[PDB]
């Protein structure tokens, strides 16, 4: 296993037995990648274990995979842990399984069914508002991640299922509580073997507790709709006329994961970046003012003419994409770009480092939301810039997250600016597990325009 690389001529970190190069992660996925990117330039080969992954960099070859033979060759991202039922969470699923669920879910994030949300997620904002409001009224130091994840809770399970479940008014919250709860795989991936073993156990990489609470409460939520509109869980209830209750659930427990955590980490990213370089907080709250005079309530047509909102949405993804890899398995040999790729590696995409990286992007460190203007928006690689993926099986929720990230956004900067105080990380600093998250919570002042 461990001489394959050697073998195709393809450079990297020499592995050891049976960890491979799983202690190079010391410093985290991000730092590995970007110092073999360094070492090694636009190919590289390494062992996660004895799982040989080859990253690309070569915008051509990323298009390939990502691309062109997604469907013949790499359709599936790698197997996942000890999972359960979740084994049916479309992420996970395989193949035809994949195809049906996606081609079955698809229609959940239309323009038409996204604009019917506004008006939902709109409430949702003002509620939002009203919280930090009170909060500003004291001066008191607001951890973006619990107000910005309440109002997330909210948005997607009433987008998603038709219910209120009203986490902003709720500091007890049972979604919130057990939704993050829901988050060992260094052992495990210096031992692949166990999973299958795992299955016989029946134990999970969340609690029995979280998956009891939320299989409960998406069954409740389906017998109250089966006791209006079209939403994520019609859809799924809809084709059970060819869905099971146990897949109709995974797919819930996927979506209201992603459209709770996602969506309120990436807001809080942005608001530190908008703290920290006032004159883009200024100049995006001109144009909210501009678009919508004297306070107006966002539209659907009205968020798609805010040019400089989403310069800085993008931005902020250049500098933090959540998803930090991309990943495909390699599923029969395969030459692609002059190169050779034998089945069962995984290829992989550093997102994170490509959206670090010099040759593409003048000055990368540094915040600048004008490289997203239409001046530049032609200097761009669309694979270099991969903070959603791409091709079939890029991420499904992208106008979702955008469109309701841009809501928070301007009813929060319509009434409020941010700024740092005593308890902001100045330098933020990124927490070193294999998650995009700051080292410590974004804390920053909200005071009333
Ligand atoms: C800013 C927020 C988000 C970001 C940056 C993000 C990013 C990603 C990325 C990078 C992937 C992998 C795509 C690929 O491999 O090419 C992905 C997949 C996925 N995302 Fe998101 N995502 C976000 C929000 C959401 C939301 C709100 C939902 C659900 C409503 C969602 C649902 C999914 C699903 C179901 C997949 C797997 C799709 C499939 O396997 O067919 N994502 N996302
Ligand atoms: C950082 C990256 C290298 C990885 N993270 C994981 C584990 N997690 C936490 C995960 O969400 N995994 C995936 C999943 O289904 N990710 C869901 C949600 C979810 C997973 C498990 C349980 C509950 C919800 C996330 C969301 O759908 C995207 N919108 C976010 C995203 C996508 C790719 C990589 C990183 C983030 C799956 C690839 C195992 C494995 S690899």
């Keep these: 296993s461990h001489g394959l690389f050697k073998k195709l001529g393809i450079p990297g970190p020499t592995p050891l037995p049976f960890l491979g190069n799983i202690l190079s992660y010391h410093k985290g996925f991000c730092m590995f990648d970007m110092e073999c990117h360094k070492k090694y330039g ?3 080969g390494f062992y996660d274990g ?6 690309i960099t ?11 033979e997604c469907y013949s060759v790499f359709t599936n991202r790698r197997p996942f842990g000890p999972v359960g039922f979740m084994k049916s969470a479309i992420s996970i699923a395989e193949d035809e399984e994949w195809k049906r669920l996606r081609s079955l879910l698809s229609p959940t994030f239309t323009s038409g069914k996204l604009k019917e949300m506004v008006p939902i997620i709109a409430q949702y904002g003002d509620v939002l508002v009203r919280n930090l409001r009170r909060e500003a009224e004291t001066g008191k130091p607001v951890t973006l991640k619990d107000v910005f994840g309440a109002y997330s809770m909210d948005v997607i399970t009433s987008t998603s299922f038709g219910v209120n479940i009203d986490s902003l008014n709720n500091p007890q919250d049972p979604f919130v509580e057990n939704t993050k709860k829901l988050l060992f795989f260094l052992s495990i991936t210096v031992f692949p073997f166990l999973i299958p073993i795992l299955e ?13 609470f939320l ?24 084709s059970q006329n060819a869905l099971s209750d146990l897949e109709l659930v995974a797919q819930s427990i996927i979506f209201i994961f992603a459209g709770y955590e996602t969506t309120s980490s990436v807001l809080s990213f942005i608001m530190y970046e908008l703290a920290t ?3 883009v907080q200024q100049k995006l709250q001109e144009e909210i003012d501009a678009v919508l005079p004297n306070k107006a309530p966002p539209t659907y047509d009205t968020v798609l003419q805010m040019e400089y909102l989403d310069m800085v949405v993008n931005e902020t993804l250049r500098l933090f994409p959540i998803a930090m890899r991309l990943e495909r398995v390699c599923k029969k040999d395969v030459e692609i770009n002059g190169m050779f790729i034998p089945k ?3 290829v992989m995409i550093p997102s994170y480092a490509l959206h670090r990286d010099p040759k593409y992007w003048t000055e990368p460190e540094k915040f600048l939301p004008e490289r997203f203007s239409k001046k530049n928006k032609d200097n761009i690689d669309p694979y270099i810039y991969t903070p959603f993926g791409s091709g079939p099986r890029n991420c499904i929720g992208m106008r979702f997250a955008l469109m309701n990230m841009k809501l928070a956004l301007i009813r929060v900067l ?3 600016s941010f700024k740092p105080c005593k308890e902001t990380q100045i330098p933020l600093k990124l927490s070193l597990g294999g998650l995009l998250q700051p080292e410590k919570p974004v804390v920053l002042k909200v005071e009333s325009r």
């Design 344 to 346: 069962g590696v995984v």
């Design 58 to 68: 070569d915008p051509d070859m990323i298009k390939t995979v990502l691309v062109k």
């Design 50 to 55: 004895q799982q040989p992954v080859l990253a």
């Design 215 to 238: 299989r409960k409460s998406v069954k409740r939520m389906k017998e109250s709709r089966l006791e209006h509109r079209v939403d994520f869980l019609q859809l799924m209830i809809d």
């Design 42 to 44: 636009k190919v590289w």
């Design 414 to 416: 319509q009434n409020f």
């Design 277 to 279: 370089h006032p004159d």
């Design 200 to 212: 016989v156990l029946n134990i999970c990489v969340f609690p029995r507790e979280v998956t009891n």
